[model samples]
Target: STGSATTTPIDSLDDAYITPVQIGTPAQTLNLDFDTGSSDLWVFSSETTASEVDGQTIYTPSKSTTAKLLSGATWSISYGDGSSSSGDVYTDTVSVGGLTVTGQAVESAKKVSSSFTEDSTIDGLLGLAFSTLNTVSPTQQKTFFDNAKASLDSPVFTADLGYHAPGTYNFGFIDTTAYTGSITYTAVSTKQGFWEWTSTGYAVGSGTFKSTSIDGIADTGTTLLYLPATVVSAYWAQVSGAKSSSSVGGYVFPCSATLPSFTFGVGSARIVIPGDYIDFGPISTGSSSCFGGIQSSAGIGINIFGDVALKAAFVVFNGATTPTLGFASK
Candidate 1:
């Protein structure tokens, strides 16, 4: 029923993008957003026109005591939703909290379409997600994790979101106190750029859909969970008299009973989606017609296990080292 893309938690150490360190001087702190869905670090610059919503802080090399721009490389990024932006490539010392990473690459857009200018309050974004799908060039590429990994106090990076809180997105080294127990991990895949994944199928209550297979990256920015058609049909079959009805641009089943439990296998890690997820209703009239999950992107191809599936666990995108993904409790 809604458009979707994956975004990860970002904190305002400065604004969102990680602050760039000034070579030979104290690191330049930059606000950066930790986005896994896309790979690129963008920021607002003094050059950004006032027409652009200036919600986040801008990075101006001329204003900084230390800034470096990689000459002759042009950077342009586009979104599936028809949004686009273009900028120049630059390098600067970047810092996040007390951690400072030297020679970090960054982008400052010159011409941006309304899709970006309208919604963005700040001038740029910092992509700390995965490197496989990175939009940054190899010559100037420096992801937050790529440069800062060695400095991390722990081997893990964690993100916590106050979805209900005002601008609640926390990122940095994992905060163990936030979870109940030790963290869990999954092995790294050798796959290229795409956010790749593997699952054993789904479980509903005691019943399970063994025949179903799910493959895609875990995206926190995405609002809806999309599944292949075959799997959708099989899941609906489990709900007694749960005929497929089109609502909110996707399939919906109006059953309130405790449905089967679905479990996802991320390598050795197993995450379970309880029955309540399936019975989700709208906050308005409390009608079951507003479903918790649905079947879309049937013929569209790759299945995207969006926020509906990702919110249940803690996700880590290891772009700093060789590309790998890890999940544990939030």
Candidate 2:
């Protein structure tokens, strides 16, 4: 069945957008971050230690008559930001919007890192990536989208992310009214379990676009845009009083600095990130120093076009034979 879901920002944290998902017979609702960067549907659950869980809601599989434990099956995942979780699995009916999937592997977190424990808003992660990336043991699990694809009108999803506002995530079909202008399609490489693509080049501000190709992934889970160290250095060099701060991490500049627009080339299309968006809020509360949204993808070999970059465009995640990415101005 064709369906659509709307997501809202988590308080002041523009880092993540979450939507409500229903699981099991009685339909327990959980607010999950639909992450394109990862491929496991995991949630804090009754199995988690009381000390590990804060104000987050826990999914209780035992309460659902239809929930069945996947005996001996387990999953563990670590993110680029060092956040991690490990847990047991349960097969239950999971529903997103109006689309439902029976026997979806729902990982119940028994342990979680400080990063996830402290973030009370996000109940769990709903991975939108390919099913091949699922971390279940013995046998891999399929994503919610994958299990529901055959029943869908079309095998595609669109992410219409907004800037500190509510946005819509359409399933099985693209809403032409949600975007303006024609969508520019780019071939995607999923070898790395991500919607990765090669950029033709990039430029800082009004400077000439460079032709150096950069391979990166479009990660909705990540908060900022991460590029090569050299590219990040060049962009921050243009900003006066900007420096890479180990204490704060990444490049920090005066909040009042006149930031330049960052542009990336995708084939003939150029996605431009405005200067204001580059100033990813203040480094600290009530502080005059701010962190650059575009940082170095040092340890992580691939660059990430996170929320900072994705919010600037309407994206189509085409789950076709040769998965492609379609971009259009919001």
Candidate 3:
């Protein structure tokens, strides 16, 4: 029961990635962000109000004979921006790539934030974190990965995030041709339902690797690499004319400044992100201030090895008896 699907970035900034998912009887396709940081698969649907429906695709459960209402089951997820969506639940046949899962719990959005309505790239999110984090009421619901695990040849999945290019998501087996050298394995801490792990250290450009133990989660939904202020400040120091701006609320540098490559350690594995990756383009259309891809995570509560970092490696979310995460060079 192995399958693969393409995940593509919506813009040049690599803001967010979207994967097509088939829901219902005749298979209505909806673009969903596969979020490793959260654990609830919800989508904009016919249930979502017209005011909140802009240009995104909708999943009409009423059209699916297989759709069964999860009576009295409600779900809601709030974002850090104070935006949220709330909805009821339905169990139906769902498929990703070519893999199928019956009776998969699907959260249909009845209300959505304007932030979501304005963005036509992603219709919803397909959470891959542990189901324990699901926001469903009364009865908790398993995520798509959890529900499909039993039928998969192996209870694992891989995320090959991209840099302004198309990526891939593979379920059940590792794609041998997708990576280089050896795959580095690390233990995952699911204490709070995140793909959290500790990295050994980091290095700025050609400098020495600092031996600091930094802990963080790999979040596919998040756009930037967030680390401690100490690490972020060090990276910025190497770039000429870079400064922390109170107005911009982040570090920015001369658009033409010489940027250095960023590197981080996972156990003994080192993933080096190219200099241009951290450049993040110009801050504004005609502004000379270029934003950095790495930011301080102190305000985010938890450090995040987001897409900026994940795009550099081939990651495997190994849902084994004792869960583990694997990283390899692409």
Candidate 4:
């Protein structure tokens, strides 16, 4: 079976993408961020402390007969005393679009960090990454994608993100009409549990392409694009008044500056990120200086092709025996 779902940007900055998910037998619909970076289908639930939730939807497992508590199973995105989300687990019938995964692990959040509690754009996270990244211990759990892949007509999923609007996520089959040109396929390395792959260099605006391979992961959970410091520096250098600001963090430039497009190679295919996407709003509301959407991956330890770069192309996550990634222009 196959399915399709709409994932819309949650904020003006396109900081996050949220998709609606139906959990439990009665279909408790909650908006969740489809995170390709993590592997835990967790949600804000009735189990959560009342003061920890505000302006967010809650998933009440008690209401569904199919919801069975996975006693002793617990998950957490935190190892620290502060700024974390932890919860117990339940297995329920979870549905996305028209596809259903019976007995899907639905982590019911009992605790969340202040940041997650205050943010209302997403009530949960539907992990699309490899199951190896799941935080559930003692007995690790499979992700929604991992469980559903076996029955899918094709063990693949695609992400199509549009500027200033909503996009679509397809499972099992590729939507021929959703992209343009032939899809260029590249082998993927999931040993680290991420959709990790190598990009064939990049070019700033109309500059000549560099033939260097960049190791990175495609993360829908991240807000911006992060690459090698040298590559990011070169791109930001093209913008007038652009400066590396320690105080502001990363590169910031005049909001009205004429930004340049960023082009990255996926195999031989070139995906271009329009300048509008790089002008990632202002550092603060109404500020004259805007933070660049591209930043250095130096301190992060790994290069990440986040929303800024992913928005430039239609990305395919092919979960075959030998996993591969496909890219197409749209």
Flag the better candidate by lDDT, 1 or 4: 4
- Candidate 1 has an lDDT of 0.55
How high is the lDDT of residue 142 in model 3? 96
TM-score of each: 0.70, 0.97, 0.98, 0.97
Regions of model 3 farther than 4 Å from truth = none
Model 1 per-residue lDDT tens digits across residues 1-330: 111112333332111222222221443444444555566777766666668644655566776555676787667788544667777776776654445566677677777778556544434555645555556554547566656656665444554432322222233455455555455554445364555666657655565436444677655444456776766676667776565555355566554545555566665456666555455554237565445464566654556666556555666654444555666654
With candidate 1 superimposed using the best TM-score fit, by how many Å does residue 288's alpha carbon deviate from the native?
Answer: 9.8
lDDT per residue as tens, model 4, 1-330:
998999999988898899999998789999998988889999999999999999899999999989999989999985111356888999999988899999899999999888788888789888888998899976899999999999999999999986778998888999989889989999889988899999998999999999899999999888899999999999988998999899988899998898999999998889999999987878988899999999999878889999999988889999999999999999
Cα deviation of 265 in candidate 3 (Å)?
0.4
Model 1, residue 199: displacement in angstroms?
1.4
List RMSD in Å for every model shown.
7.0, 1.2, 1.0, 1.7
Worst 10 residues of 1 by lDDT: 12-21
Per-residue lDDT of candidate 2, residues 129-216 (tens digit): 8888999998899998888888889889889888878898888998999888889999999898899988888899999988898899
Error of 3 at 224 (Å): 0.5
- The list of candidate 4 runs beyond 4 A from truth reads 78-83
Q: What's the true lDDT of residue 166 in model 4? A: 96
Residues 67-121, candidate 3: write the lDDT tens digits.
Answer: 9999999999996556789999999998999999999999999998888998988
Sort the candidates on lDDT, descending order: 3, 2, 4, 1
